[PDB]
């Protein structure tokens, strides 16, 4: 379930397992030195049969690895206080105001902050000035009869902005 391709692969699947087991081993293991010991031990256990030219025995060892992992996880895996699941999970979302607002203000406060609204207005003219031709031509131009991907090409043509960028650029600053 991922934007790039239809699956992870074998490689990244093993990799995510290694990240999870190392993270759980943090969450199991305090004092950081025995942590470092057991981390090198775990790396050696993956080093034992890294170089199988076989594939089916490798993926079977992957499944038996997942069994001994899920038997040995932690009750509180150590989630960082910025991640979803974690302590924050858009903690300061109280002030994550989208910027389609701030133009519906009374012109007294548009007189209170003048230069900002002048440059914001030329931003919106930058948006609309290159909205129709380049962006919609680049979208209906390149792909197959079905799109069949979730990436999108840049604006390498000559000049102006890559397509469909407004709600990517204009976001909250994640600590206001």
């Amino acid at each position: 379930f991922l934007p790039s391709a239809a699956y992870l692969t074998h490689q990244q699947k093993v990799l995510q397992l290694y990240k999870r087991a190392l993270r759980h081993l943090e969450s199991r293991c305090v004092h950081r030195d025995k942590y470092r010991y057991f981390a090198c031990l775990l790396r050696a256990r993956f080093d034992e049969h890294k170089n199988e030219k076989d594939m089916v025995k490798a993926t079977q060892l992957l499944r038996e690895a997942e069994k001994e992992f899920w038997h040995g996880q932690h009750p509180q895996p150590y989630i960082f206080p910025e991640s979803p699941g974690g302590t924050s999970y858009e903690r300061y979302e109280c002030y994550k105001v989208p910027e389609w607002c701030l133009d519906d203000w009374h012109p007294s406060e548009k007189a209170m902050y003048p230069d900002y609204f002048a440059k914001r207005e030329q931003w919106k003219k930058l948006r609309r000035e290159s909205w129709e031709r380049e962006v919609k031509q680049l979208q209906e131009e390149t792909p197959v009869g079905g799109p069949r991907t979730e990436a999108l090409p840049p604006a390498r043509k000559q000049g102006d902005l890559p397509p469909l960028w407004w709600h990517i650029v204009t976001r909250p600053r994640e600590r206001p």
Partner: protein, 157 residues
């Protein structure tokens, strides 16, 4: 607006054109369209989904709707109001479910039985009752001003 044929009468039959129509309609894979089936419970022709789906959908994909894991176009599992996170969280548990319920019922049953064993068998530090001064401290309980003296005494022991 909204087309008349984007509503949804009747179940599955017949399988060529109706399953093709529901695949074109609900935006699903063709042989993954599952009606419920028709036991006549209402339910129309809306899909079955894999039904847990909300402590699933790992939160780094960056879809559209941030607190619902929507993607603007999934056919939206029938019981969704029971599945917004803050309502029912079906995480894959760290243990089981059967192991959970058997150990919890066992612990609370054992402790309530020990409470009954406590209730039949008190402790006391070995001491008789107190020596209330005027006839088990009478006249200062519920009333009885001149009705009856209730003679009972205490002796120095």
């Amino acid at each position: 607006s909204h087309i008349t044929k984007d509503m949804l009468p009747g179940p599955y039959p017949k399988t060529p054109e109706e399953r093709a129509a529901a695949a074109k309609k609900y935006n699903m894979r063709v042989e993954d369209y599952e009606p419920y089936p028709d036991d006549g419970m209402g339910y129309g022709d809306y899909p079955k989904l894999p039904d847990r789906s909300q402590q699933e959908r790992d939160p780094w994909y960056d879809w559209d709707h941030p607190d619902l894991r929507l993607n603007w176009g999934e056919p939206m599992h029938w019981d969704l109001d029971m599945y917004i996170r803050n309502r029912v969280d079906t995480s894959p548990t760290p243990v089981n479910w059967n192991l959970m319920c058997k150990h919890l019922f066992g612990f609370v049953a054992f402790m309530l039985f020990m409470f009954w064993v406590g209730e039949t068998y008190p402790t006391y530090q070995p001491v008789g009752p107190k020596q209330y001064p005027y006839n088990n401290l009478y006249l200062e309980r519920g009333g009885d001003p001149n009705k009856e003296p209730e003679p009972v005494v205490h002796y120095e022991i």
